[PDB]
Amino acid sequence: DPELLARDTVFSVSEIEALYELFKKISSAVIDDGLINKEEFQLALFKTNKKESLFADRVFDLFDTKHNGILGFEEFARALSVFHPNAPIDDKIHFSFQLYDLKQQGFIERQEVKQMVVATLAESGMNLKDTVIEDIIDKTFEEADTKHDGKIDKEEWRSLVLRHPSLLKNMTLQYLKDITTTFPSFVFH
Ligand SMILES: [Ca+2]
Ligand SMILES: [Ca+2]
Numbered sequence: 001d002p003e004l005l006a007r008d009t010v011f012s013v014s015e016i017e018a019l020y021e022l023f024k025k026i027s028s029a030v031i032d033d034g035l036i037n038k039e040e041f042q043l044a045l046f047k048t049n050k051k052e053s054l055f056a057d058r059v060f061d062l063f064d065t066k067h068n069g070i071l072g073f074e075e076f077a078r079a080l081s082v083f084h085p086n087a088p089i090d091d092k093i094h095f096s097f098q099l100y101d102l103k104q105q106g107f108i109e110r111q112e113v114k115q116m117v118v119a120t121l122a123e124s125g126m127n128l129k130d131t132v133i134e135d136i137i138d139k140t141f142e143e144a145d146t147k148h149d150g151k152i153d154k155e156e157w158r159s160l161v162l163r164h165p166s167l168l169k170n171m172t173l174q175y176l177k178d179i180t181t182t183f184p185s186f187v188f189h
Helices: 002-008 013-027 038-044 053-063 073-081 089-100 110-123 130-144 154-163 165-171 174-178
Strands: none
Touching: 002 013, 002 073, 013 038, 013 073, 038 053, 038 073, 053 073, 053 089, 053 110, 089 110, 089 154, 089 165, 110 130, 110 165, 130 154, 154 165
């Protein structure tokens, strides 16, 4: 039932029904098989470029319940729900932390902060050399590492992103607000 999805996610029953149309488009975009793969999901997030695709694939991984490289409708709906422009900021902050906390240890170190920096630059259309990335990592700790212990907390992360909302730019897909009326074009290249 679309009633169970609407309840467990930020979408309303009518948004879920519209999301099913989006699902048919996205699941058909590369291989027409009724399923969503990583390349198709990249298309849904406008993250098809080889540097931007890492973020989309990490998101994919968190919602791929069976770890089989495929998402069905329910998984897709859940995946997209936090990207809704009306999803609470706290859901976006919480989810984005899980994203960069690859080891699920409750904190991020430089290697994980590096991924966040790379993903954050990619959103602004920017790719920098390793040594410049390392300087930005330095500044991020300077800023976020309030409780000095060489790692960024969930609480230090929330604080960081509240002072710098442009870090949650990749956590919103603007087209989801208007899903009951209009649809973007998605074509694979
Ligand atoms: Ca497919
Ligand atoms: Ca800390």
